[PDB]
Ligand binder design. Sequence first.
Ligand code: A1B2T
Ligand code: ZN
Length: 139
Amino acid sequence: SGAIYVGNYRVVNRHLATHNDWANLVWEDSSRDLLVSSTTAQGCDTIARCDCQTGVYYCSSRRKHYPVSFSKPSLIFVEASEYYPARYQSHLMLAVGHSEPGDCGGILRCQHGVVGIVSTGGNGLVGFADVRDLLWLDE
Ligand SMILES: CSc1cn(C)nc1NC(=O)N1CCC[C@H](C(N)=O)C1
Ligand SMILES: [Zn+2]
């Protein structure tokens, strides 16, 4: 679990969104596993606006942060699960790192701010749903 709080927005993995998230929906994209909902309070997370390929992510299954090199956002095939059939997930970045399903939501950050959230894994790899292209999170 985990979310990004910036302005009047909350960003979560779409597969982990709540009834409140869906009843306060701004935008959602199943192909990216993202869902953004509105909030009453003001969030102060800075979103990175960069092309960084290095950063640090929070791994809840180890109660530890890990430094990673990660790939450019792209269309990567993702196995079927209880939330989605087998499909290509877009805007996904992979890195060599430990992850388990409950890790989804963990933030990935570089020196410029929040890069994205843990969204996929398996086989000694971890995938992050990129949010840097969502410029409207600031306006
Ligand atoms: C949840 S990350 C993970 C780590 N391991 C070992 N296995 C993992 N499971 C996954 O990759 N997914 C299950 C939850 C939804 C994900 C998606 N975005 O389609 C796919
Ligand atoms: Zn950066």
